[PDB]
């Protein structure tokens, strides 16, 4: 009797191929089902009964399919106030159904508000100190009202919860800032502002299970240091533990480093060792499925 | 130098009075600031700077006040898709500011989706079993589409995230159910359905710090049992630990008990020992302020 | 070709662990070499930089035979302590932890399991929290030594001495005078003891938990599991950070009630008919842990 | 009138704890009665039903004087073990846990602090995770006993024996031959030992943590705290479920680098000028814990 792994991801990656031949306890095979958040739905009962429906409208000329995923791998962003959608209810549904996940459904749900995730980093920063964990000095605004000025310029204003660059606005002066402030009022949601950092390069330190990799963007794989490891290790402990994550940091011309954010299981695979990362995620998942 | 406690609650309760004379370490006094979620705002910086603004429009003929709360006591519901508002961003702001709270800001934030809270109880139910933890067999619907029938009738449909009864609808038959199903589609949010329980009485088992009380509604204070204690103790462990909480359960004419839900720090104080509860919350908070 | 991950299994020779592990591979690739010895036959040196060595000396036929190894993981199926000559392997447990070697059960739990009443103390806390109706722990008494052993409130009483096991070091005393005799014997052990009301029992029950597999045996007959039984073993399995292999021993007295006596760790004997199936469950557990490290 | 909550403080007579606790009240209402004795002078009986008794016998002037008490809380300021006559109070610690009595530090940590290398083993894990650039732990070697002590890679070397303390049981050996002499002495202790490269040191540093208060002393001069120092003590304070009172001892060698030697628990000596302020910090800590229970 085979185990069913549901992978929530865009079609770009053929997960069935990297999971092929992988067996649980060296006996049980794994059937890989792959879909995007938008193509899934479900019903969950407190008695354990459930059903995850896949597609409806997609290739195959319309078809309704029922799966009973034994495990889930979430490689896609669960929420976005623009071009993505609100899948927070699906995450809730998966948790209600008691389906094991990577990353945990708990972390996925809690990752729905970027500044909520950032708030965790503020606590680590408070504890560790700048010499150990140099978090960028960002400002959170629950509501636009008091967005008067920015202590300096330019300032990057990040609006609501957006990904891959969306919702960001570089503001070079007091007047332009005030314009964006009004736009923030029209969004009916919070936003953050942070000083603009004139950087020499970007660094992303990733952690998949127990495997670490550091890449330098300006992508070149650079050596890991205890400093880098501390950043990602501490970050990987948030929301009960992140199995797949990465810390994005900038290296200022000023010499100082600045931690910008931490990304979860939907973190894009980068560099030229993408097949290594993919294979590591497979071993991680398989191992969790066995011990589940 | 006195400690500042911000209490988020409706005006009904004079918290300043129950906190009067209470001192931290027997030395430091406590200044109690009390407001409703709707009358507060803030700005938080990752460097630790922050400011919680109180009122603007309220008694005193308009006034803007700044507080630097050292601690917060949350006695009000943080989110409601009807008659209350969305204060989830304020909770995020308070966490971003690193302000200690009761209950924890983490639990308060995670309590914003009732079915997400219920999902925790499903896991405990799965683990403990019905003989130990009799959770009602509720059904979660991420999205209306598949709301065809209810295995039985009547069925109580709870819509989105509402409190104090709001958003509930008792549906006695297949046809009326289908009407409500359409209303759920028009809500653009999830809902749950559960079999209607013809009850002899209601029971609410509460836990404030280490003090337990059980009340029976039909309110009469009834003795605690190891069964009752297990329900509330297990429930109090969710989202890292709830300092103030209660489990609502129904006692069916059928003899079987049914756990309905768990409420957080905003749980209403009931019965005739309301001043005891109030005094217990004070000792709890004061103790946390000292060790903070 | 490609090196094998070495698993050290600390157990008596009666069970051939290499056989149940044969063909089992990590990530479906890496082979496992199973080394098996007893605590007595082991020594080690551990450095804080990560360097280490676990040497074996099982004097089986060959005299003074030392075969050195380097374990990637350890499976502890033998009791680490005894108040009898050659009964202390606590320093080895400390050495294994000092070497950072992953284990089942955790080295932390194994070390903490060295004093039975310390383990019992954990159950006392669970009992205090859950209550008798949920967790009926026997009303045992701890004496850090013989000085306060003037009397017991009820007799007969079973007196358990310092570190015994396999039902040893147990003595049932029936009266005040005989109790005072045993009290002197306890002094001669220069160690602590416990006393508990004798429970004339109808049957014994052992609820076991290996990973996520549960089995309940009666005293053998495999009885069904109940939420009550599960709660006992689940709660007990959370002690000392989590026990991967454990079981709760309980009596069903002639009185018609249940009594929790103790909890055993990874060295718990495999009983009943399903001994091979549980051995394989232990194999699957260990392999999966090895893959995670 | 209204009964007082009894606090038992296990410490030598040099510090008058009753004085620093005087007038301190729980919830601003309840009074605290402070009982103070040493481990040697204590015995107890604990029952799983919650019944218990902690009897005192401080033979100060009066012979065979027993004053019985019932502690609501315990403050452990004395080292629970020593490989010297009358050095084992591990059974008392087990008895206190069996009695469910709340403590500072936790009884769990106190019990686990009985074997220094077991405590060190925790630091080895932190060191392995953090790396030398973040957490520079000295490269110490553990020997479960004398048999594997053939040689050391570098000499001189400080050999620390089984359970010593206050800088005792320490021996600096300079060569292969002298090392072999000490190896035999270790055999005569029938216990484990550790060896570490001698570090000719410029100065000593002790980073302490009492609740949320930090202080760093140099060897006395109070130096400022740094994020590096804080990380060392914060990480160390998380061991064994959390240490409320602790400190990390580190050397700054003549070599111009830092070396972490060890971490001490609630029995850590109060040093420097701020001894009274730290005593009061300990008082505030304890009182607040008493109120929570």
Distance from CA of C27 to the nearest CA of A (A): 7
Burial class (CB in 10 A: 0-12, 13-18, 19+), B199: middle
Q: Quote the tokens at residue D96.
A: 């206190």
Inter-CA distances, C65 with C36, C61, C68, Å: 15, 9, 10
Burial class (CB in 10 A: 0-12, 13-18, 19+), D225: middle
Q: Which residue of A has its CA nearest to D233?
A: A128
Q: Do A128 and D226 touch (CB under 8 A)?
A: no
Distance from CA of A74 to the nearest CA of B (A): 17
Q: Which residue of B has its CA nearest to C128?
A: B226
Among residues D40, D70, D72, the alpha carbon closest in space to that of D55 is found at: D70
Q: Which CATH number fits domain B137-196: 3.40.640.10, 3.30.1490.20, 2.60.40.420, 1.10.3720.10?
A: 3.30.1490.20
Choose the mutation target among A276, A287, A292 for the interface with C, i.e. most C CBs under 10 Å: A287
Query: Would you call the peptide bond into D156 cis, given omega within 30 degrees of 0 as the criterion?
Result: yes
Using CB atoms, which residue from B130, B131, B226 is nearest to C130? B226
DSSP letters spanning A162-180: --TTTTEEEE-SHHHHHHH
Asked if A50 is an interface residue toward chain B (Cβ–Cβ < 8 A), one would say no
Chains that touch C (3 or more CB pairs under 8 A): A, B, D
Task: Compute the distance between CA of residue D69 and CA of residue D42 in angstroms, rounded to an integer.
Answer: 11
Asked if B47 is an interface residue toward chain A (Cβ–Cβ < 8 A), one would say yes
Encode C108-137 in three state secondary structure: HHHHHCCCHHHHHHHHHHHHHHHCCCCCCE
Choose the mutation target among C224, C230, C235 for the interface with B, i.e. most B CBs under 10 Å: C230
D chain contacts of residue C124, beta-carbon cutoff 8 Å: 48, 98, 100
Instruction: DSSP letter for A135, please.
Output: B
Residues 24-43 of C with CB under 8 A from A: 24-25, 27-28
Q: Which residue of D has its CA nearest to B287?
A: D288
Q: How many CA atoms lie within 13 A of D159 on its CB side?
A: 28
Using CB atoms, which residue from B46, B95, B118 is nearest to A136? B46
C chain contacts of residue A210, beta-carbon cutoff 8 Å: 293
Q: Do B43 and A141 touch (CB under 8 A)?
A: yes
Asked if D256 is an interface residue toward chain C (Cβ–Cβ < 8 A), one would say no
A chain contacts of residue C283, beta-carbon cutoff 8 Å: none
- Please say whether the beta carbons of D104 and D266 come within 8 A: yes
Q: Which residue of D has its CA nearest to A125?
A: D227
A chain contacts of residue D130, beta-carbon cutoff 8 Å: 226, 229-230
Q: Do A98 and B138 touch (CB under 8 A)?
A: no
A chain contacts of residue C292, beta-carbon cutoff 8 Å: 209, 287
Using CB atoms, which residue from C27, C284, C292 is nearest to A25? C284
Chains that touch A (3 or more CB pairs under 8 A): B, C, D
- Long-range contacts: C21-24, Cβ < 8 Å, 24+? C21/C283, C21/C286, C21/C287, C23/A26, C24/A26, C24/C283, C24/C287
Which CATH code is given to the segment(s) D106-138+199-269? 3.30.470.20
Going B3 to B9 to B10 to B12, the CA torsion angle's sign is negative
CA-derived radius of gyration, chain B = 21
What are the residues whose beta carbons fall under 8 Å from the beta carbon of C216, sequence distance 6 or more? C205, C206, C207, C208, C222, C223, C224, C225, C226, C229
Task: Compute the distance between CA of residue C5 and CA of residue C31 in angstroms, rounded to an integer.
Answer: 6
Encode chain B in three state secondary structure: CCEEEEEECCCCCCHHHHHCCCCECCCECEEEEEECHHHEEEEEECCCCEEEEEEECCCCCCEEEEECCCEEEECCCCEECCCCEECHHHHHHHHHCCCCEECCHHHHHHCCCHHHHHHHHHHHHHHHCCCCCCECCCEEECCHHHCCCCCCCCEEEEECCCCCCCCEEEECCHHHHHHHHHHHHCCCCCEEEEECCCEEEEEEEEEECCEEEEEEECCEEECCCHHHHHHHHHHCCHHHCCCEEEEEEEEECCCCEEEEEEECCCCCCCCCCHHHHHHHHHHHHHHHHHHC
C chain contacts of residue A283, beta-carbon cutoff 8 Å: 27, 291
Q: Which CATH architecture has domain B104-136+197-268?
A: 2-Layer Sandwich (3.30)
Q: Is A5 helix (H, G, I), strand (E, B) or coil?
A: strand
Task: Compute the distance between CA of residue C127 and CA of residue B81 in angstroms, rounded to an integer.
Answer: 43
Neighbours of C187 (CB within 10 A): 14
Q: Do A129 and D227 touch (CB under 8 A)?
A: yes
Which ranges in chain C are annotated with CATH 3.30.1490.20? 139-198
Burial class (CB in 10 A: 0-12, 13-18, 19+), B227: middle
- Please say whether the beta carbons of B157 and B191 come within 8 A: yes
Task: Compute the distance between CA of residue C116 and CA of residue C140 in angstroms, rounded to an integer.
Answer: 12
Q: Do A233 and D129 touch (CB under 8 A)?
A: yes
Q: How many CA atoms lie within 13 A of B192 on its CB side?
A: 28
Task: Compute the distance between CA of residue C130 and CA of residue B227 in angstroms, rounded to an integer.
Answer: 9
Q: Which residue of B has its CA nearest to C231?
A: B128
Among residues B161, B213, B222, B164, the alpha carbon closest in space to that of B188 is found at: B161
Among residues B240, B159, B230, the alpha carbon closest in space to that of B194 is found at: B159
Distance from CA of B81 to the nearest CA of A (A): 14
φ, ψ at C222 (rounded to 5°)? -80, 115
Q: Do A26 and C27 touch (CB under 8 A)?
A: no
Choose the mutation target among C127, C128, C129, C131 for the interface with B, i.e. most B CBs under 10 Å: C131
DSSP letters spanning A240-265: G--SEEEEEEEEETTS-EEEEEEE-T
Task: Compute the distance between CA of residue D130 and CA of residue A128 in angstroms, rounded to an integer.
Answer: 13
Give CA A5 to chain center in angstroms: 20
Q: Is D275 helix (H, G, I), strand (E, B) or coil?
A: helix
Q: Do C94 and D43 touch (CB under 8 A)?
A: no
Task: Compute the distance between CA of residue B228 and CA of residue B83 in angstroms, rounded to an integer.
Answer: 33
Going A259 to A261 to A262 to A266, the CA torsion angle's sign is negative
Instruction: DSSP letter for D189, please.
Output: T
Asked if C177 is an interface residue toward chain A (Cβ–Cβ < 8 A), one would say no
D chain contacts of residue B210, beta-carbon cutoff 8 Å: 293
Task: Compute the distance between CA of residue B166 and CA of residue B185 in angstroms, rounded to an integer.
Answer: 17
- Please say whether the beta carbons of D148 and D269 come within 8 A: no
Task: Compute the distance between CA of residue C61 and CA of residue C67 in angstroms, rounded to an integer.
Answer: 14
CA-derived radius of gyration, chain A = 21
Q: Do D231 and A130 touch (CB under 8 A)?
A: no
Which segments within chain A are labelled E, that is strand?
3-8, 30-35, 40-45, 50-56, 63-67, 71-74, 79-80, 85-86, 101-102, 139-141, 155-159, 168-171, 191-195, 199-208, 211-217, 220-222, 244-252, 257-263
Among residues A261, A93, A259, A239, the alpha carbon closest in space to that of A161 is found at: A261
Q: Do B92 and A140 touch (CB under 8 A)?
A: yes
Using CB atoms, which residue from B23, B26, B287 is nearest to D292? B287
Choose the mutation target among B109, B115, B116, B125 for the interface with A, i.e. most A CBs under 10 Å: B116
Q: Where are the alpha helices (DSSP H) in A7-149?
A: 15-19, 88-96, 105-110, 114-128
Query: Which fold does the domain C139-198 belong to in CATH?
Result: Dna Ligase; domain 1 (3.30.1490)
Give CA B154 to chain center in angstroms: 27
Task: Compute the distance between CA of residue C104 and CA of residue C267 in angstroms, rounded to an integer.
Answer: 10
Distance from CA of D27 to the nearest CA of B (A): 7
Choose the mutation target among A283, A284, A285, A292 for the interface with C, i.e. most C CBs under 10 Å: A283
Torsion of CA B120, B121, B124, B129, to 10 degrees: -150
Using CB atoms, which residue from C24, C27, C285 is nearest to A283? C27
D chain contacts of residue A227, beta-carbon cutoff 8 Å: 133-134
Task: Compute the distance between CA of residue C24 and CA of residue A252 in angstroms, rounded to an integer.
Answer: 50
- Please say whether the beta carbons of A7 and A72 come within 8 A: yes
Burial class (CB in 10 A: 0-12, 13-18, 19+), D216: buried
Resolution of the experimental model, in Å, one decimal: 2.2
What are the residues whose beta carbons fall under 8 Å from the beta carbon of A276, sequence distance 6 or more? none
Task: Compute the distance between CA of residue A33 and CA of residue A15 in angstroms, rounded to an integer.
Answer: 9
Using CB atoms, which residue from B128, B225, B226 is nearest to C227? B128
Going B210 to B214 to B220 to B221, the CA torsion angle's sign is negative
Angle, vertex CA B254, rays to CA B248 and CA B257, nearest 5: 25
Chains that touch D (3 or more CB pairs under 8 A): A, B, C
Query: Which fold does the domain D3-105+270-282 belong to in CATH?
Result: Rossmann fold (3.40.50)
Q: Quote the tokens at residue D115.
A: 């074997």
Q: Is D77 helix (H, G, I), strand (E, B) or coil?
A: coil
Distance from CA of B29 to the nearest CA of D (A): 12
Which ranges in chain B are annotated with CATH 3.30.1490.20? 137-196
Residues 183-202 of B with CB under 8 A from D: none
Q: Which residues of A72-106 are buried (b: 16+ CB within 10 A; e: fewer)?
A: bbbbbbbbbbeebeebbbbbbbbbbbbbbbbbbbb
Q: Which residues of D83-110 are buried (b: 16+ CB within 10 A; e: fewer)?
A: beeebbbbbbbbbbbbbbbbbbbbbbbb
Q: Which helix (H) or strand (E) holds C87?
A: none
Asked if B132 is an interface residue toward chain C (Cβ–Cβ < 8 A), one would say yes
Which ranges in chain D are annotated with CATH 3.30.470.20? 106-138+199-269
Encode C170-187 in three state secondary structure: EEEECCHHHHHHHHHHHH
Q: Do B227 and C132 touch (CB under 8 A)?
A: no
Task: Compute the distance between CA of residue C285 and CA of residue C26 in angstroms, rounded to an integer.
Answer: 12
Task: Compute the distance between CA of residue C52 and CA of residue B126 in angstroms, rounded to an integer.
Answer: 44
Q: Do A45 and B137 touch (CB under 8 A)?
A: yes
Q: Which CATH architecture has domain B1-103+269-292?
A: 3-Layer(aba) Sandwich (3.40)
């Amino acid at each position: 009797a085979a185990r069913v792994l549901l992978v929530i991801d865009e079609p770009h990656t053929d997960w069935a191929k990297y999971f092929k031949g992988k067996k649980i306890h060296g006996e049980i095979d794994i059937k890989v089902e792959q879909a995007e958040f938008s193509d899934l739905n479900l019903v969950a009962h407190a008695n354990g009964g459930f059903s995850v429906d896949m597609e409806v409208l997609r290739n195959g000329v319309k078809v309704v399919r029922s799966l009973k995923p034994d495990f889930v791998l979430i490689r896609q962003h669960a929420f976005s106030m623009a071009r993505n959608g609100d899948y927070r209810s699906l995450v809730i549904g998966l948790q209600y159904a008691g389906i094991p996940s990577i990353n945990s459904l708990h972390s996925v749900y809690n990752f729905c508000d970027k500044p909520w995730v950032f708030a965790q980093m503020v606590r680590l920063h408070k504890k560790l100190g700048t010499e150990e964990f140099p978090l960028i000095n960002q400002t959170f605004y629950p509501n636009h009202k008091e967005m008067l000025s920015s202590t300096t310029y330019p300032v990057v204003v990040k609006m609501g919860h957006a990904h891959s660059g969306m919702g960001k606005v570089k503001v070079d002066n007091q007047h332009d800032f005030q314009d964006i402030a009004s736009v923030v009022a029209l969004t009916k949601t919070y936003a953050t502002t942070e000083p603009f950092i004139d950087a020499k390069y970007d660094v992303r330190i990733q952690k998949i299970g127990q495997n670490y990799k550091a890449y330098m963007r300006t992508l070149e794989q650079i050596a890991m240091s205890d400093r880098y490891k501390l950043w990602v290790d501490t970050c990987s402990e948030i929301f009960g533990g992140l199995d797949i994550c990465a810390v994005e940091a900038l290296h200022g011309k000023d010499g100082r480093d600045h931690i910008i954010e931490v990304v979860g299981s939907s973190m894009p695979l980068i560099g030229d060792h993408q097949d290594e990362d993919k294979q590591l995620i497979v071993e991680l998942v398989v191992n969790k499925m066995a011990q589940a």
